Amino acid sequence: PFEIEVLLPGELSPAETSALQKCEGKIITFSTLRHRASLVDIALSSYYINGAPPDTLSLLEAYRMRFAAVITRVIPGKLLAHAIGVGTPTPGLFIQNTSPVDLCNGDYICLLPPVFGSADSIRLDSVGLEIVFPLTIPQTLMREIIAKVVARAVERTAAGAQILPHEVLRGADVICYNGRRYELETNLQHRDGSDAAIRTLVLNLMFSINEGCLLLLALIPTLLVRFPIYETISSWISTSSRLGDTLGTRAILRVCVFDGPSTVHPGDRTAVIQV
Amino acid sequence: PFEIEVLLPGELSPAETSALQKCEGKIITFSTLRHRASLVDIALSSYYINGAPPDTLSLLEAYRMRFAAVITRVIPGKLLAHAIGVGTPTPGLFIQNTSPVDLCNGDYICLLPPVFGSADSIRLDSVGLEIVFPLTIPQTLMREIIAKVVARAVERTDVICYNGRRYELETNLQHRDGSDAAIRTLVLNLMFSINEGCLLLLALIPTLLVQGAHDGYVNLLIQTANCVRETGQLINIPPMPRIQDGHRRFPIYETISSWISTSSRLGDTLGTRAILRVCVFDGPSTVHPGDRTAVIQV
Amino acid sequence: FFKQIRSDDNSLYSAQFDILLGTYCNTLNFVRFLELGLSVACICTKFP
Amino acid sequence: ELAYVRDGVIQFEVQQPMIARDGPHPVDQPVHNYMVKRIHKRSLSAAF
Amino acid sequence: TTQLIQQVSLTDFFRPDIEHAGSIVLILRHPSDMIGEANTLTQAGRDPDVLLEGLRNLFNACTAPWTVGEGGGLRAYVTSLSFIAACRAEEYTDKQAADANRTAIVSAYGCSRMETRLIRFSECLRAMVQCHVFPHRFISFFGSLLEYTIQDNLCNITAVAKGPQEAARTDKTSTRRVTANIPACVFWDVDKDLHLSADGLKHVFLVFVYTQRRQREGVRLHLALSQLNEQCFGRGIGFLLGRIRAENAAWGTEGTRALPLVQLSNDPTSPRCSIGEITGVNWNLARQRLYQWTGDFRGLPTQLSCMYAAYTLIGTIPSESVRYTRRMERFGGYNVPTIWLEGVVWGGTNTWNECYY
User: Fold this and answer.
1) Which end of chain B is more exposed for a tag (fewer CB within 10 A), N or C?
2) Residue A118: how many other CB atoms lie within 10 Å
């Protein structure tokens, strides 16, 4: 069984130690797998690129390019973890729910960057670094969640751009799972993450669809009864393939509960199996 | 752990057995999986489609059709290979770098036929066959090569910059029966990626061109694009229709959802899928051509 | 303070102590006036 | 038994002398000092 | 080497008493999500609450009907494969095997409030595929049944999750080993239709064929066993289902001049619209015409209205030259033709691939 030991720093405040101990079954993400590592690899500081803090697109790409692990137990002077990597037979692997939606038996686990609300995370001001944890969600909901957030962004952009708004609508977007609705982003104000972390994402997702469903028409005008024309096709194919590889869906864990409560709520810890 | 044992033909010369032992960590393909097999299926002769050596586009499909395997310790008599595709635990797996480009940690591996200069391959004059080995390149290079090959095929019916060095592609398309299949599978996705939602995205073009200025970022998005850059100053885009049932429906949802699945399927249908991930323990961060790395099953 | 564990939930096999690695101090010396070479610059005497 | 050391510590204690002078300024006072120092841990590895 | 999954549920769709050990068991999502998805994905023009009408009557003919809405954990979670096979038995090609299994599951069960339950479930699926709420995202998969305990109308069952089939110990039957058993109606191997050799390793898939017409929809359930690749199965299925694909492409949606962009961009002396006027001061007289195109595309077949199948990998068989055996044995008080699969390793994540072509 492969395990990682994260070295706890010296001279840490007791409130911070307790806050860390509270986060028992949480997913951390390591760049290169090694038995001994430091807190700089776990902190957000290792995730940001080009100097600026990371984007949602950057986080989605890092979640693929980077390896994962789960915290197993916290010691007043040490911190351990177990990988979900190569072949390790981790016994008694348990995970704590971080998403507002519920989970049941036989659901597969997938990772996301925080999109709904502000990410909750530990932050040591003594050392001066924060440790953000990725959201865990079932598989059947992530496609819908991504589509809805991009649609909300594009609708906001369109309402801003058009001289007049087309406000007439159905109410508010909702996500229902296990007979429980979420009702995300009630108010129009509080543009916290409207264009803070999904800006480049929505830009690229608009551009690719525009290119595609304009090039089809430009190539064949029969549909509705000086110029390269080939580098365009090349670039479109390349961009579409890269964006699809980025916005993938790959299950990482399966919730297997034995002799326990089937449905679990945000905050409970459940034993899972390595897929 | 599943292993397939390839029976080497007898009477083999010392030169040929040494050349084969040189091949230690390479990928091979099997049409049908079984514990005992022969050398004919590994031979290039098994790739023949009608009566002749295959084409690039036919190999691109044979690779998806066939099961994959990785060679391991070879003995003078037999040839040992482990499987990849079917879910099977393999501890301590490794692959030999066959591509001219270099690999680093956390890189997904794909499989493409030899597109660069004449492929090195073991030849057996006594047996009368040769064994070509597939090339392994990262995902970005794979996507770019596939896009360029599809564009060249369209043109018929190439330079690539990676790590600051320019490589040249010579593609083979002497066959024709398989060239139109790529066209068909491209146009199918192009047609299915259209629905009632594109109207708003196309009308949102003038504000996009506006935001392009005083941004410094969208300009690059605009320069690589040609269709929108030409249409924003050439088409009028009549203003707007209404929605049939706008009181409970959301029409910009399907155009953003279905496109995700279309894009995820395109990258796998046009070429090959990801097969492995490189993750070396206690090794170098980057690997040079010809060296071996420890990789994990996808 | 009250708590009870179901059967056995670790949190007991966590022997973590603190050690003191000894102390170090210093003892200053004392300088006498006559032992210095400056005493040959004057004649000192005691007058109660 | 170093694997469970959990931040051992060491400390010092020094005191400095003083001079007897008299004039248009306040008098001195013997002052004492106290320091403390922590440890740092690092390992070594080799393959076979 | 193998793992198990337990869950308690109501026994109105599953009876661990009569069902043989080693049969497939599936689970269902909360029905409350169906309406939240239907009212937002229903095609324009169609009525969105016909599913609600079809759904309410299902639980109205089911025990404890006053327990819908809260989802406290005491609903009809799991179901059996033979149940859906009997609900849609009028659509399988093997006429006699279908109807035999139907009468068998009717008689072995309560047989009093069973026929009504079946017809409610039938139009329930029919209304499910009426507003694009396709029942391939609400039906998951569990392993073969291994052990069960029931006292009345409520059962606790445990099944295998993934791994070898005969690596467990049922420990109460005659032998301690079980093998996979399926009704002969759902079994459909494609290689013997595609005319290729059947040797080596073969994968297992579940398919959901969809028919979309006016007031006539159909949904079967087939357990395909083929040696074809992970993704190549999609191209293989279309060759056999080429009829329904074309039927749907014409009867799926039942509820304008081109523009020469490349032509007028290849030639000069066309009305230009340089960035100097899009800066945003008078952007209406600059774009007065520049073209008209009178263009709009509202009613067109989407990739979701032409879907006809959705498959998913379940398990493989490493032993080459499989020898599946078909025979008739008693199921309660009636005989049904069952096919027996031996040595099948479960696994694979629950991801559905939709064949829309």
Assistant:
1) N
2) 8
Interface membership of A38 toward D (CB under 8 Å):
no
**Mutation site, E24, E33, E298, interface A, largest A CB count within 10 A:** E33
Within E61-190, where are the H helices?
Answer: 81-87, 95-108, 115-128
The size of chain E, in residues, is 357
Query: The tokens 């999500």 sit on which residue?
Result: E33
Put simply, whether C45 touches D (Cβ < 8 Å) is no
Residue E312 burial (CB count, 10 A): 18
Tell me phi and psi for residue E194, to 5 degrees. Answer: -80, -5
Q: Which of B139, E234, B190, E232 is nearest to A245 (CA)?
A: B139
| H or E stretch covering A138 | strand A135-138
Query: Please, what is the Cα angle at A215 between A210 and A219, to 5 degrees?
Result: 160
Q: Which of B168, B129, B120, B121 lies closest to B38, judged by CA? A: B129
Q: Are A210 and B227 in contact (CB under 8 A)?
A: yes
Residue type, E310: A
Residue pairs between chains C and D whose CB atoms are closer than 8 Å: 39
User: Which residue bears the tokens 């949602």?
Assistant: A56
Residue B110 and residue B89: Cα distance in Å, rounded? 20
**Residue B21 and residue B52 in contact, taking contact as beta carbons nearer than 8 Å:** no
In eight-state DSSP terms, residue B138 is: B
Picking from C16, C17, C23, the nearest residue to D13 by CB comes out as C23
- The structure was resolved to a resolution in Å of 3.7
Nearest to B102 by CA among B146, B143, B163, B145: B163
- Return the SS3 of E236: helix
Q: How far apart are the two ends of chain C, measured CA to CA in Å?
A: 72
What is the Cα–Cα distance from E229 to E219, expressed in whole angstroms? 25
* CA neighbor of E81 nearest in space, from E133, E139, E23: E23
Which of A65, A209, A242, A249 to substitute to test the interface with B, most B CBs within 10 Å?
A209
Determine whether the interchain pair B32/E227 forms a contact, defined as Cβ–Cβ distance below 8 Å: yes
Determine the 3-state secondary structure of E28 from DSSP: strand
- Write A118-123 long-range contacts (CB < 8 A, 24+): A118/A192, A122/A16, A122/A19, A122/A20, A122/A23
Q: What is the DSSP letter of B224?
A: H
Contact B264, E231 (CB under 8 A): no
Looking at chain A, which residue has its C-alpha nearest residue C18? Answer: A77
Residue bearing tokens 């609900």: E87
Question: Which residues of chain A are within 8 Å of residue E70 when distances are taken between CB atoms?
Answer: 179
* Spatial distance between the Cα atoms of E10 and D25, rounded to a whole number of angstroms: 95
In order, the DSSP letters of A19-82 are HHHH--S-EEEESS--SEE-HHHHSGGGT-BTTBPPPHHHHHHHHHHSEEEEEEEEETTEEEEE
Closest to D31 in 3D by CA, of D6, D9, D14:
D14
Q: In whole angstroms, what is the distance from residue E140 CA to residue E351 CA?
A: 10
Element spanning B168, H or E: strand B165-168
How far lies A58's CA from each of A154, A161, A206, A243, B144, in Å?
20, 27, 18, 12, 20
Chains that touch B (3 or more CB pairs under 8 A): A, E
Residues B295 and B276 sit within 8 Å (Cβ to Cβ): yes
Whether residue C16 and residue A76 make contact (CB cut-off 8 A), yes or no, is: yes
> B and A: touch, per 3+ CB pairs < 8 A?
yes
